[PDB]
Design a protein around this ligand. Structure first.
Ligand SMILES: [Ca+2]
Ligand SMILES: [Ca+2]
Ligand SMILES: [Ca+2]
Ligand code: NA
Ligand code: NA
Ligand code: NA
Ligand code: NA
Length: 217
C-alpha cells in the first residue's frame, strides 16, 4: 500500500503469539533521503493501559506485546509519528485503529442464583409462570458466541409427573405444560435450568428456579 496510511487492523483476542507480534509496518516516504524514527501514542501505548502496543523505532514495525481481551477493551485508537534523525516531525500523526475481535471465552451467567416465581394451581396448559435470564459477555452481533439458549435439566419433585413445565429456548419464559398442579399435594417445585451459548451448541451454565404453587382462592 501507500506510505503513511493504515486501514483498521483486526486482532482476535486471546492470541497465542509469539509476543511481541508484528501487526503492521509503518513507513514514511521521507525515509528516501532521511533516517526516520517512528513512535506511537494513545491509550494502549503511552497512556493506560500502557505498553500493550509498541513500535520499533527504526523499522517502523507496530507490535502487540501481549494477548488482548475484547471484554476489557474492544478497540484502540493510536497515533503513529515520524520524526527525522535531526528531530523534525516529517508527517502529520497517523490514526491507527486496532479492532479486537471476539472469541467465545465466557460461559452464560444467570442474573440470579435462585429465581423465584409462582403460578395458580388451576391454570391452563401454556400459562406463563416466570422468566429467567442469563447474559453472555461475548459477541452476539456477528456470531452466536453471546447467544444463549435455555432448557430445563430436571424438576424436583417428579409429582404428579416428570415435567410439569417447559421453557422458551430464547426468552427464558417458563410455562405450565401439564395439568395436575395442586398446592395441597405439591406446593413447590425446584427446576434446574440451563443456559447454553452458541445458541445451544456451546458451554452450559446451571442455576435454579423455584416455583410456588398458589391456592385457587
Ligand atoms: Ca475475553
Ligand atoms: Ca459465550
Ligand atoms: Ca469474548
Ligand atoms: Na488462544
Ligand atoms: Na407467575
Ligand atoms: Na453479548
Ligand atoms: Na390442577
Amino acid at each position: 500500500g501507500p506510505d503513511w496510511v493504515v486501514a483498521p487492523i483486526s486482532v482476535p483476542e486471546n492470541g497465542k503469539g509469539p509476543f511481541p507480534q508484528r501487526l503492521n509496518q509503518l513507513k514514511s516516504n521521507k525515509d528516501r533521503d532521511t533516517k526516520i524514527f517512528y513512535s506511537i501514542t494513545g491509550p494502549g501505548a503511552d497512556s493506560p493501559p500502557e505498553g500493550v502496543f509498541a513500535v520499533e523505532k527504526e523499522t517502523g514495525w507496530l507490535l502487540l506485546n501481549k494477548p488482548l481481551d475484547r471484554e476489557e477493551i474492544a478497540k484502540y485508537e493510536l497515533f503513529g509519528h515520524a520524526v527525522s534523525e535531526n528531530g523534525a516531525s516529517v508527517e502529520d500523526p497517523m490514526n491507527i485503529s486496532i479492532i479486537v475481535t471476539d472469541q467465545n471465552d465466557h460461559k452464560p451467567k444467570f442474573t440470579q442464583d435462585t429465581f423465584r416465581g409462582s403460578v395458580l394451581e388451576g391454570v391452563l396448559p401454556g400459562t406463563s409462570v416466570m422468566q429467567v435470564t442469563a447474559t453472555d459477555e461475548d459477541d452476539a452481533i456477528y456470531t452466536y458466541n453471546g447467544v444463549v439458549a435455555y432448557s430445563i435439566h430436571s424438576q424436583e419433585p417428579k409429582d404428579p409427573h416428570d415435567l410439569m413445565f417447559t421453557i422458551h429456548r430464547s426468552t427464558g419464559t417458563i410455562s405450565v405444560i401439564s395439568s395436575g398442579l395442586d398446592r395441597e399435594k405439591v406446593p413447590e417445585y425446584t427446576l434446574t435450568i440451563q443456559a447454553t451459548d452458541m445458541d445451544g451448541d456451546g458451554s452450559t451454565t446451571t442455576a435454579v428456579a423455584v416455583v410456588e404453587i398458589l391456592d385457587a382462592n
